Amino acid sequence: AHAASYLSVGYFNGGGDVTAGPGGDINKLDVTQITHLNYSFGLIYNDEKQETNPALKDPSRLHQIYLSPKVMADLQLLPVLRKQNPELKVLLSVGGWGARGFSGAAATAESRAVFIRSVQQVIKQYHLDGIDLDWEYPVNGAWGLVESQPADRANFTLLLAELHKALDKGKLLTIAVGANVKSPQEWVDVKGIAPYLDYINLMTYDMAYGTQYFNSNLYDSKQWPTVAAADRYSANFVVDNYLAAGLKPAQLNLGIGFYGRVPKRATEPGIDWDKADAAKNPVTQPYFTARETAVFKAMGLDLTKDSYFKYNDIVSKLLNDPQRRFTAHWDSDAQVPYLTMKSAEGKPLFAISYENPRSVALKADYIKSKGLGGAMFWEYGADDNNRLAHQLAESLGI
Template sequence: MRQVKTILFLLGILFLNNSCQPKVNQPMQEKVVVAYVTSWTSVMPDPAYITHINYAFGHVTETFDGVRIDNEERLHRIVALKEEAPHLKVLLSVGGWGSGRFSEMAAEEALRKSFANDCQRVVKEFGLDGIDIDWEYPTSTLAEISASPDDTENFTLLMRDIREAIGTHKLLTLASAASAQFIDFRAIDPYMDFINIMAYDMGSAPIHHAPLYRSQYAGGNTAHEAVEKHREAGVSYHKLVLGMPFYGRGGQGGFPRGMKYHDIERIEGYERRWDDEAQAPYLADSAGAFVCGYENPRSIAVKAQYIHDKGLLGGMYWEYADDNEAGDLRRAVYNGVIGRPSGAPVK
């Protein structure tokens, strides 16, 4: 009888140990708010309105076998926020528009594994919670970086190798094009915690660059369509994080091509209008012409409702420093995503 009790006790311990092991593919129960914080700005983010920070950027080294970090001192200061906010997760985002050498690195096993091991070194050395990969984009030379038809397959191998290097207790995420192109999402799914959809830069004035739905001012894509394209590509809703811009895109009638929200808020001489179909604001000139599409607290609240209704994991934005001093946009994201917004159901 004593032997039976001993066996049952040991089995119980084994069950508890196994049940407590982190598993990559377990759905995250709580919503996330992911803020990109850049190396070239000085404003310190308020962790009260963020669950995750993606520090931008790290890059593939010139020798194709490691990670180089922009402004390491600032990254240390960002990580130090965890001392006052233990809930905060900080990841290094490797890549960004025009950041290359991914194709060469991912193509060779030795270089790829060396890069993955250096990701683990960086995570340990800086006290990070994971790695975010922002390769824009596998197989594409649009950003004037090297590319190969084999990039998509090699991207999968890269995700596998990074996961193996950093372990299952650290986060592995990526920034994905709104089109859901370039990546084999079904193949990488076992290695990924979640996917940040860059549901912005989908057009320039005279059309919106981040509309939720279609309207006469929407171009080739919308945030809703971007979500559905990722779902069709094999990503579960609960692994999708919807990206939102803290800046506008103009370029018409002498209006600047890009403008941060804190500047849009103060600009004079333009009419602020609301596109009820797209659920997005825009600026119009004195002739009524669309000159800049952007995001405001109202459109963010609508997107937060969408996140809840669709069962998405949360919201992401680029970038923290583009908000106004009062933090209207970041508060709208946090309150909408982490809180309990109410409104009309998703179309």
């Protein structure tokens, strides 16, 4: 009797990101193609001893939000964006990969009150529609990259309950959560925080690690299978894990990557920690040689440090490489594209998987069939002339 309504929540790396690099130009974005913009990132002033950003070590602002000069200048521009799309909602996202300070901000009644006052101050100064918290990750700390403790799980629940209480009615409160199965199991009380959140952004990407080839496959590949069980991920598997934990599909946005990654399997031995003497007996071995790593390095991707390739750069540098070194393929099971490069021996080598318009549309179909609330994407600055956002908008009837 009536049509569904869907969200399309676009993160934008405006201030810079640890894995994705320097911030983009906010003026390039087509804000008519999205329902919500998550301007990224606000950081957190913190007392973590390993913090290397000295601005954040100001003890007089501990637990408050830090906005860099570029973030402040870009947020000046919201009136212009809202005139372009008067239905747009704009949030600040706080955190991101490698961002410190959540564990300490969440830890006490006092610290949470300082952080919440700062959220309110920023929302009011910059006239935001809400706040998104991208803590990567409670309890796990991204394997040591940020401070963490087991109390983060319950403390995050308290922070969200208190922030929900403090926010003006009508303001949005959202979070991003990880793909890892331990996130709903051990890091985040998803069922307990659900009542406080307008929606939850699933980061259903960054799967091209360990023995897995694909970065954002919808289902598992059969032609290019992951070998170790602990590495075997797909977007659908992640969604099912979150549904198993008691979230309703309508509250979830499926995260879509406007980028790809060269799999770690290309350059690093893959270890299956379920195996006997695992580290000495890798189950996959690297198939890139100096020849292939040199190609990526020349494009600015040093694979010893980084595997992230923006979609617009995949199009310009890989698909449209003048030397024709990259061949485009489709994985029919995974429902995503990938490129190969030809070895000196003549064998196709799996170089990178990503999302193109066909695969973004197939993830929208999944959203529609599974009854998810919408899509989210990381991130708008990596789109090619707003094309992937436009596909999403079309597919979801935005």
